Every structure is written in structure tokens, then in C-alpha cells.
From Swiss-Prot, chain A:
Participates in the formation of new permeability pathways in Plasmodium-infected erythrocytes enabling the uptake of nutrients from the blood plasma. Required for maintaining invasion capacity of merozoites. Required for parasite growth and proliferation. Component of the RhopH complex, composed of CLAG3.1/CLAG3.2, RhopH2 and RhopH3 with a 1:1:1 subunit stoichiometry. Interacts with CLAG3.1/CLAG3.2. Disulfide bonds join 2-9, 392-452, 472-513. Disruption phenotype: Knockouts are not viable, suggesting an essential role in asexual blood stages. Conditional knockdown results in co-depletion of CLAG3.2 in schizonts. Co-depletion of CLAG3.2 and RhopH3 in trophozoites. Resistance of infected erythrocytes to sorbitol lysis. No significant effects on the activities of parasitophorous vacuole. This is High molecular weight rhoptry protein 2. The chain crosses the membrane at residues 358-378.
Length: 516, 97, 49, 97
């Protein structure tokens, strides 16, 4: 497969690479003793590591105490040989002092046989899942020198072909065995245990996933270019960003995959319900889907609540840099969220939390974070209208993917991202199975901001102002000047909203123009 | 639980009253405090990671699979998660007063 | 308990609690539920430092 | 010559006649069983550590009480009422009233 279920194959090949590299290390280690420490344990090392037919013990078996201070010394020398040219991890490697080396040499032998991880932690907080090999189940079983090794060594149909093949070639220059194939089969059957979970994924949404990924890793197509992200971190704040990111991706790791699949579902439904003139970008069509979220089985938990919960977790993590609630200054501090977003969609550096690649979740969660930290007032009238205009232009200027110089012809991926943005904005204000223009209990602010977004720019007031002074005709016995305009706008804000005012003023002044 | 606390304090009072060739009445309090700190640090696990310790605490959580556990083990989990960080501070107060 | 009941009736909390156990949970709402239950049981002994 | 200044007067000095006591130390170590905490653990009865742990049952997690008092600003006010100031001001005001 590896093409329909993107994520299950992405989970399989990580385990394959880990097994291959650790087996390479453990098959390179034995020949090392036949070169230094001429007769410490030269050959019977493998005969003790046999484990064929067993449990393990190097103390009771081999009951010659004048063996540790040389065996473990040679082993530590080997491990510090592997982690060379870094001059920082070597310090922590020389300070090991077995049996923090014996435990490694036993757990690494237990992993390369039965493909498990040899868990001896609290055996009620693990559920038949925290045993498969991956970079996270190794930072949770106290296997940390293994990560030192994997960090020092082996570390730095067009788009589909590129990403899938041209870089999932760890298996090159490798050969299977009579054994060693059963462990690959075990990894595979571990990965694909969700035979219906992680549902719809095919050329419908698969193509969009690969297009967004390739666009980010080639041109930098995100809500904010990564160069700007990096160019705002002054030198002496970089070691805490890494810690605010690493902890968000370790603990909230299953909710991110859940949100990923839930966004894939709605992209499937969008492409399955079917042009860009105003259909797919008008209010009523998108409102149909926004109604699809209230009442594939039509349950579909709201994907704004999930992103809001993750925003809550991120905003709690960010507050580790001070000891005050940080109420309205969550902005001016969004560099943390943006570093996390880069690490979540891009190539994840810092191999202690490396996992999946979370393409959709990044777009949705970054939009939600921006909305909830900049463009909201629910938790804090002419100048109020100035503030509406300022926030609306900030929002509409944030949501544009490509900016610099290329011509704006709206390729398909840009269309799909625009549709996702408008759905996320019409889920922010909707409060039931009823269009949010005709409902009460929706704030004055939210109807106006939704209208200001769907028209891409100006306002709901200045639009009609330009449209009416187009038929300049009206200048009767009578009045024009922004005065009459703000008169009609307060008429709006008092009478009732929203399209009632739009259509009724439209036609009243159509008949006014045909009057004079 | 003011029925086991009484027994523990009585035991410690006896141990102190019988050994005054050690325990100069300010070494007993320090010794008890360090014993409580060891009783506390015997609670920390690698799951619910290291730096998730004090670190201007906002990194603290319970477990990756807190839910799905049970209706009665996931309160023992609350007790362990709290005691892993706040056992010496709140036990030493009662003991010393 | 009034403050807890005010917390539990939000949009993003109701829309997630609807699917209590038919799906995955945020692992954070269950903590609040357990805390309020345990408090309502031993409501006369607790101390807050 | 500088014994009667201000920096030499506000300090303590602590001289006492030397007692003749067994040498157990709280300071470092090693290779010799002279440690006060180990000695205290050795002077205890069989079951006392588990009696020390079975006190102090924790009920209200910190993460469950923060979400209402610290980071209260990250809460959508329900349909209707405006912001309700956090659970500490409410507590002290209701107490006084």
C-alpha cells in the first residue's frame, strides 16, 4: 500500500529505519573488542549475547568480578567513539558508570529480538501500544543513550513520487535474511491495525496533502514564511523555544492525529459534494457545510472545538516564561506558537519528539490561534468601527498564502486553502442550525466580521456606500456626504441585520435612481 | 488521615527519645525532612517526564492514557501525580507542628 | 460546584462531551469531572494551602 | 581590630562545649555507613514507610483548580453573562460577606 494510508506507512518506515540502524550498531560492536583490550572477552561476548536458548545476566553468569571494569570500559569507549565530533554528549557518555551501561547493553539486545522494547516501568499505564519502536516510545522507556547514538550518527505523480520514494530509501544498500524478515512482518502488522480507522484517504485528499507538503518544503507556502519566524528570535531566547515546542508535541500527540483525520474527512466531503466564481466562496454554500457539522454518519465532532482545546493547551504551555496570567499579552508572544507550527508541519528537528508530519492540523490550528489571540474581543461606536476595520484587514491579510511577487491566478491548492479558511471563520461564529445573519445571541461584532471576511476586504458598509454613490443620482432635496452614509449605517445597526439591510437598501436606491 | 499520622509521630518521638547520643534536636528535624524528600522522590517515573518537574510549573500532566484506565485507578493516579511534587512540603508542616 | 457547573456549559466543552466514550477524549475534561466528584464526596475534610 | 563594627555585630557565633557523641553525618559520604538518614531508616520498625505514605490523600489536582483561577481568561463566557472574575476573588468576597 503505502499510498492510500499515508500515515500508517509513515509509521511503518520509521520503525524499519530504527531497527536497521540499531542492528547495524550492534553488529559493528563485536568486532571492536577483537582490536582493543586484546583479551577482555574477545569471542565469548557473542556466546553470552546468544540469548537463543536465555533470559539475561552478566553478573551471576560470568561470575568473575574482574570482568566488569574492563568490559564496560571498552563498551563506554565504543559508545563515545560513535558520538564523536560533538564535544557535548561525550561528557554525559563518559559519566555513565554501569550498570547504566549494562541496562543499555541488555535492552538493546532485547529489542533486536522479538521487536519489543523491554518495558519495566509501571505496568498499568501501558496498553499494548507503548512497545513499538519509534522516537517517542524511546524517550518514554528511559532509553536515552540510544537516542544519543541515533542523533550523532544518521542525522543532518510528481509530488507524490518525490516525497514517498525519493526520501523513504533507508532500505537502500540493505539485504534481508532468513531471520530478520519476521521482525519486518511484525512491524508491518503493528502499523496496520486500524483496518477501518484513519478513514478516507485517496487521490481526493491524498493529492492535497502531498501538494501542501511539497509547497511548504519547496517554496515556503504557509500563513507566515519561516524566514520571518526565525528572524524574530533574539540570540539568547532560543533554548526555551525548543523546550516549549518539545513539550507540546510530546503530550498532545494523539489529539493532533485525531484533528488531522477529522480535517481529512471534511476535505473528502467538500470534494465529494461536487467553478470558483462565487460558488465555493459564497456564504450560503459554505453555510451548508457549516450546517453539516451540527446535524460520513453526520456526527463529525466540531473541528473548531478540537482546535480550541489545542489552543488552550498551547497557551498554557507558553506561559512558562513568566509568573503572571499574561491575559491580553498572549500576542506579542506568538513567536512560540509559530516555532511550534514550523516544527509541526516542516521537517521536525530536535530528535526527542520526532513523529508524524501533521499537515492539516498546522493550518487549522494556526488559523485558530491567530483568531483567538488577535482578532477577538469576547474575553477582554465610531472608534469601535475603526477597530472592526483594523482587525478585519489584519485577518484578511494574514490568510493569504503566497505574497511576494508571483501572479495571483489561484491554483487549485490556493482555492482549497481559501475554502478551509472561510469554513474555519464561519464555524467561529455559528451557534446552531441557522445561518448567522438571521440569528440573535450572535454578537454584533461577529456578524460584521464574518461579512467583512466573506467580501474579502473592505466592509459591509463601505461596499454599499460605493455601490450607491455609483448612482450618484441621489443628491435630492436632500443629502449625500459621508453623513448620509453613516446615517444609513446606524439605520442598519439599529433596525436589524444583515442581508435585510443589504437587499432593501440596494433596491430602495435602485428605485431611487430610476426615480431621478 | 489523623489516625496513621498519630502512630507515625509517636514512633518518631520514641526513636528520638531513645537515641540522644545522636540527634541533637536540630539534626532530627533535618533527618526527617530528608527522609520525607526521599519518600517523595520514590514517586517519579520517566513517563510524566523529568523537566515536567518543578520548572515554574506549567508542564505538569497526569499520563498519556489517563483516560481508559478505570474509574478507580485514575484517582490513585491523581494521588500519585500530586504526591510526586507536593509530598514533603505538606507533610513536614504537620509533622513539625 | 456552581463554578464547576459554569465551566462545563461552554460551547467547546459541550460539543466534545457529547461524544463521551464513542471516540477519544482530551484527557483534560475527565480530570475536572474526577476532581469535582472526589470533592463532592469528601467535602468536609479537604484543605487548600 | 575590626570586631566592634556593624558587620561583625549582627552575626552569630555558636560556641558550645564539645559533646562526645557517635559520629553520623548528614553532609556527604561514603564507603562507611555513617549517614543519619540511613541510620534513621534502620532504627524504624518493619512497617512504617507504608504507614508514612498512607497519610495525606490528595483530592483536588492543581491542573483542575488552575483552569478556574489562573488562566481563567481562556474560558468562553457562556451564552448570556459576562466574564466572572476568578475563583479567588469570588471566594474572599463571599467569605467576607
Amino acid at each position: 500500500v503505502c499510498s492510500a494510508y499515508l500515515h500508517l506507512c509513515s509509521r511503518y518506515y520509521e520503525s524499519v529505519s530504527i531497527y536497521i540502524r540499531l542492528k547495524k550498531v550492534f553488529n559493528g560492536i563485536p568486532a571492536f573488542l577483537d582490536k582493543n583490550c586484546r583479551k577482555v572477552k574477545g569471542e565469548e561476548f557473542k556466546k553470552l549475547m546468544d540469548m537463543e536458548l536465555r533470559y539475561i545476566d552478566i553478573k551471576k553468569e560470568l561470575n568473575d568480578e574482574k570482568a566488569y571494569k574492563q568490559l564496560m570500559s571498552a563498551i563506554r569507549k565504543y559508545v563515545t567513539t560513535l558520538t564523536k565530533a560533538d564535544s557535548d554528549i561525550t561528557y554525559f557518555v563518559k559519566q555513565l558508570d554501569d550498570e547504566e551501561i549494562e541496562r543499555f547493553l541488555i535492552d538493546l539486545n532485547f529489542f533486536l529480538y522479538n521487536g519489543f522494547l523491554r518495558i519495566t516501568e509501571d505496568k498499568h499505564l501501558i496498553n499494548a501500544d507503548d512497545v513499538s519502536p519509534s522516537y517517542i516510545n524511546l524517550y518514554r522507556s528511559n532509553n536515552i543513550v540510544a537516542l544519543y547514538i541515533l542523533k550523532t550518527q544518521y542525522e543532518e505523480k510528481k509530488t507524490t513520487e518525490y516525497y514517498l520514494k525519493e526520501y523513504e530509501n533507508f532500505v537502500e544498500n540493505f539485504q534481508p535474511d532468513l531471520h530478520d524478515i519476521m521482525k519486518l512482518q511484525l512491524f508491518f502488522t503493528m502499523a496496520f491495525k486500524d483496518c477501518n480507522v484513519n478513514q478516507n484517504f485517496t487521490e481526493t485528499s491524498k493529492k492535497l496533502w502531498f501538494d501542501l507538503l511539497y509547497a511548504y518544503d519547496k517554496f515556503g507556502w504557509f500563513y507566515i514564511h519561516p524566514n520571518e519566524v526565525i528572524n524574530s528570535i533574539n540570540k539568547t531566547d532560543f533554548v526555551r523555544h525548543v523546550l516549549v515546542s518539545r513539550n507540546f508535541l510530546l503530550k498532545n500527540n494523539d489529539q493532533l492525529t485525531f484533528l488531522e483525520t477529522q480535517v481529512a474527512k471534511i476535505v473528502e466531503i467538500i470534494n465529494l459534494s461536487l467553478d470558483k466564481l462565487k460558488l465555493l466562496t459564497s456564504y450560503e454554500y459554505i453555510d451548508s457545510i457549516a450546517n453539516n457539522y451540527f446535524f460520513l454518519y453526520f456526527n463529525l465532532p466540531n473541528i473548531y472545538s478540537l482546535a480550541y482545546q489545542l489552543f488552550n493547551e498551547l497557551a498554557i504551555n507558553i506561559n512558562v516564561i513568566t509568573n503572571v496570567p499574561l491575559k491580553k499579552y498572549l500576542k506579542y508572544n506568538a513567536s512560540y506558537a509559530y516555532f511550534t507550527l514550523m516544527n509541526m508541519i516542516g521537517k521536525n528537528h530536535d530528535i526527542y519528539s520526532k513523529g508524524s508530519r501533521f499537515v492539516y492540523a498546522s493550518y487549522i490550528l494556526g488559523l485558530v490561534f491567530f483568531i483567538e489571540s488577535h482578532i477577538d474581543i469576547a474575553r477582554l461606536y465610531h472608534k469601535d468601527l475603526k477597530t472592526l476595520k483594523k482587525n478585519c484587514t489584519l485577518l484578511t491579510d494574514f490568510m493569504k498564502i503566497n505574497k511576494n511577487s508571483q501572479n495571483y491566478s489561484l491554483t487549485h491548492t490556493e482555492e482549497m486553502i481559501k475554502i478551509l479558511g472561510l469554513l474555519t471563520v464561519t464555524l467561529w461564529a455559528k451557534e446552531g442550525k441557522k445561518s448567522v445573519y438571521y440569528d440573535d445571541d450572535v454578537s454584533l461584532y461577529r456578524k460584521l466580521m464574518v461579512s467583512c471576511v466573506f467580501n474579502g476586504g473592505e466592509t459591509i458598509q463601505e461596499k454599499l456606500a460605493n455601490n450607491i454613490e455609483k448612482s450618484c443620482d441621489i443628491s435630492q432635496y436632500g443629502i449625500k456626504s459621508k453623513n448620509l452614509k453613516d446615517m444609513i449605517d446606524i439605520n442598519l445597526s439599529i433596525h436589524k441585520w444583515n442581508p435585510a439591510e443589504i437587499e432593501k437598501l440596494a433596491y430602495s436606491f435602485v428605485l431611487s435612481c430610476k426615480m431621478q | 488521615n489523623k489516625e496513621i499520622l498519630k502512630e507515625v509521630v509517636d514512633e518518631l518521638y520514641s526513636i528520638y527519645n531513645f537515641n540522644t547520643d545522636i540527634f541533637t534536636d536540630t539534626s532530627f528535624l533535618q533527618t526527617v525532612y530528608l527522609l520525607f524528600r526521599r519518600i517523595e522522590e520514590t514517586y517519579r517515573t520517566q513517563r510524566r517526564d523529568d523537566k515536567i518537574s518543578v520548572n515554574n510549573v506549567f508542564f505538569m500532566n497526569v499520563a498519556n492514557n489517563y483516560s481508559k484506565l478505570n474509574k478507580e485507578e485514575r484517582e490513585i493516579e491523581i494521588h500519585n501525580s500530586m504526591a510526586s511534587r507536593y509530598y514533603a512540603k505538606t507533610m513536614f508542616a504537620a509533622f513539625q507542628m | 460546584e456552581c463554578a464547576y457547573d459554569m465551566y462545563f456549559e461552554q460551547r467547546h466543552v459541550k460539543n466534545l462531551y457529547k461524544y463521551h466514550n464513542i471516540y477519544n477524549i482530551n484527557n483534560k475534561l475527565m480530570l475536572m469531572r474526577d476532581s469535582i466528584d472526589l470533592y463532592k464526596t469528601h467535602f468536609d475534610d479537604v484543605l487548600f494551602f | 581590630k575590626d570586631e566592634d563594627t556593624f558587620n561583625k555585630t549582627i552575626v552569630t557565633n555558636y560556641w558550645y562545649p564539645s559533646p562526645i557523641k557517635k559520629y553520623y553525618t548528614l553532609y556527604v559520604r561514603k564507603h562507611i555507613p555513617n549517614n543519619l538518614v540511613d541510620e534513621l531508616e534502620k532504627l524504624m520498625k518493619s512497617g512504617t514507610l507504608e504507614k508514612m505514605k498512607k497519610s495525606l490523600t490528595f483530592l483536588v489536582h492543581v491542573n483542575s483548580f488552575l483552569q478556574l483561577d489562573f488562566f481563567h481568561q481562556l474560558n468562553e463566557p457562556p451564552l448570556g453573562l459576562p466574564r466572572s472574575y476568578p475563583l479567588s476573588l469570588v471566594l474572599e468576597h463571599k467569605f467576607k460577606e
